[PDB]
Write a protein that binds this ligand. Structure first.
Ligand SMILES: O=C(O)c1ccc(C(=O)OCCO)cc1
Length: 261
């Protein structure tokens, strides 16, 4: 596997706050089609790595999703967290901006002054996001089936029919979400997907912000997010158990998965 990076994973190493690689970051000088961006990247991966673009929810900014940046980059990914052109943008707009940020990461991979010059395999990308940004991530996956993974959190869209999604998709959900209730959003969305590897992970007692920066389940959520991206963006079957398993954890009130190998 030309995409495998880093040491063989363990539960402990995936539950830790940081993976094996050293992380640095920079601010995007001139955002190409979105509001603002921070790029997180590993300084010492042994090869090119995939890129992941992450979008907040309605009214929210990079701080709500920031924690994914170092958590994912330290395991071997270039991660861009964005602010949208407006905090009031809707999911379809969020998806356009998410993909524009991926495009600019790819541009910077070819830009000799960039710290990520030659660090990105631009053919291997993923999408994540909170709430309307999670709906935007699903729209992004629907419109761009060459994306290798999606892992939205507490998603919402005006439609729950994402039968168009063929991208391996992990849905983080929050049991007590009153903004995007699981029964009208995350779960109908999950059930709609028929052609992909997919997973549903609902955090026991979680509010709408249960997968945001500062959540109290970073060990489990971080392990699952990293394992999903490693398994499907890197084709890295060393992560197949971590990606596909029921964690059989008390922090999970609802677990579902299908077509996972
Ligand atoms: O009313 C809704 O259905 C609805 C309301 C808000 C959101 C959202 O993205 O903002 C959540 C906080 O960032 C999504 C769905």
């Amino acid at each position: 596997n030309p995409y495998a990076r880093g040491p063989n994973p363990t539960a402990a190493s995936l539950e830790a706050s940081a993976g094996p690689f050293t992380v640095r970051s920079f601010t995007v000088s001139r955002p190409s089609g979105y509001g603002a961006g921070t790029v997180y990247y590993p300084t010492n991966a042994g090869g090119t790595v995939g890129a992941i673009a992450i979008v907040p929810g309605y009214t929210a900014r990079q701080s709500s999703i920031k924690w994914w940046g170092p958590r994912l980059a330290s395991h071997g990914f270039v991660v861009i967290t964005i602010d949208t052109n407006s905090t009031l943008d809707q999911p379809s707009s969020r998806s356009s901006q998410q993909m524009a940020a991926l495009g600019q990461v790819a541009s910077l991979n070819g830009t000799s002054s960039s710290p990520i010059y030659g660090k990105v395999d631009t053919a291997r990308m993923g999408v994540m996001g909170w709430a309307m940004g999670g709906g935007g991530s699903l729209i992004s996956a629907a419109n761009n089936p060459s994306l290798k993974a999606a892992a939205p959190q507490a998603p919402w869209d005006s439609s729950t029919n994402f039968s168009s999604v063929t991208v391996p998709t992990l849905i983080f959900a929050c049991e007590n979400d009153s903004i995007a209730p699981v029964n009208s959003s995350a779960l109908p969305i999950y059930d709609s997907m028929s052609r992909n590897a997919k997973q549903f992970l609902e955090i026991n007692g979680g509010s709408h912000s249960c997968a945001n920066s500062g959540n109290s389940n970073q060990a489990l959520i971080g392990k699952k997010g990293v394992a999903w991206m490693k398994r499907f963006m890197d084709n890295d079957t060393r992560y197949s158990t971590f990606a596909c398993e029921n964690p059989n954890s008390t922090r999970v009130s609802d677990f579902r998965t299908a077509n996972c190998s």
